C-alpha cells in the first residue's frame with residue numbers, strides 16, 4: 001500500500 | 009487555555025494550493041483533476057496534522073492509518089466549509105486560493121447538489137456563530153467519527169480517545185447545552201455529504217480513463233481500497249443522533 005509506506 | 013486548545017491551534021495546517029490553471033476554461037476534467045490533486049496535497053497535511061494530535065499515538069498503527077483513510081473526506085469537507093465561511097462568507101466554495109467554485113464551476117464539476125450541500129454547511133458556520141475554537145475541536149472529533157463495524161484493533165483506546173475529545177468540545181462550550189445539540193447536529197450533517205462525495209469520487213474513478221480525470225496514485229489506492237468498505241456498509245460513521 002502506497003498510503004501505508006507513506007504513513008511509515 | 010487548555011493545553012488541548014493550544015495544541016489544536018498549534019498544529020492546524022496552513023494554506024494548500026491546488027495547482028489549478030485558472031487560465032483554462034472551466035471543464036469537468038480540468039476541474040476534477042485539480043480537486044483530486046488538492047485532495048492528495050490536503051491529505052499529506054491531514055496525516056501530519058493527525059500524528060501531532062493529543063492521544064493519537066495511543067492507537068495501533070493500523071488503527072491510525074485506517075481512521076485517517078476513512079475520515080479524510082469529512083475533515084476536508086468540514087475545513088473547506090470553514091475556509092469558505094471565513095474568506096468569502098459562504099458565497100462560494102473556497103477549496104484553495106487557486107480553486108474557488110462559483111455556481112458555474114459547481115455546475116461544470118457535475119457535483120452541484122453536493123456543492124450546494126457543502127455551501128449550506130458553510131452557511132451554518134455563520135448562522136450558528138461557530139467559534140474558531142469550536143471549529144478546531146469539532147474537526148478533531150471528525151477523525152474519530154468513522155469506524156468499521158467489526159471494530160478496530162484497539163477499539164478501547166479509540167473509545168477512550170473519542171470520549172475525551174467530546175469532553176473537550178464540551179469544555180470549550182462550558183439553554184447552552186442547546187449549543188451541544190446544535191454542534192453535534194452540525195457534526196452529524198457532515199457524513200451524508202461525505203458519503204455523497206464518496207460515491208461520486210468512486211464512480212469518477214471507475215470511469216476516469218474515459219473522462220480524462222486524473223487520479224493521483226495514492227488517491228486511487230484509497231478510493232479503490234478503503235472507500236468501497238464505507239460504501240459497502242463495512243465502515244460506518246458514528247452519529248450523535250439516530
Ligand SMILES: C[C@]12CCC(=O)C[C@@H]1CC[C@@H]1[C@@H]2CC[C@]2(C)[C@@H](O)CC[C@@H]12
Nearest residue numbers: 043044046047050084085088103205209
Ligand atoms: C476532498 C476534496 C479536496 C479538498 C477539499 O477542500 C474538499 C474537497 C471535496 C470534494 C473532493 C475533493 C478531492 C477530490 C474529490 C474526491 C473528487 O474525486 C470528487 C469529490 C472531490
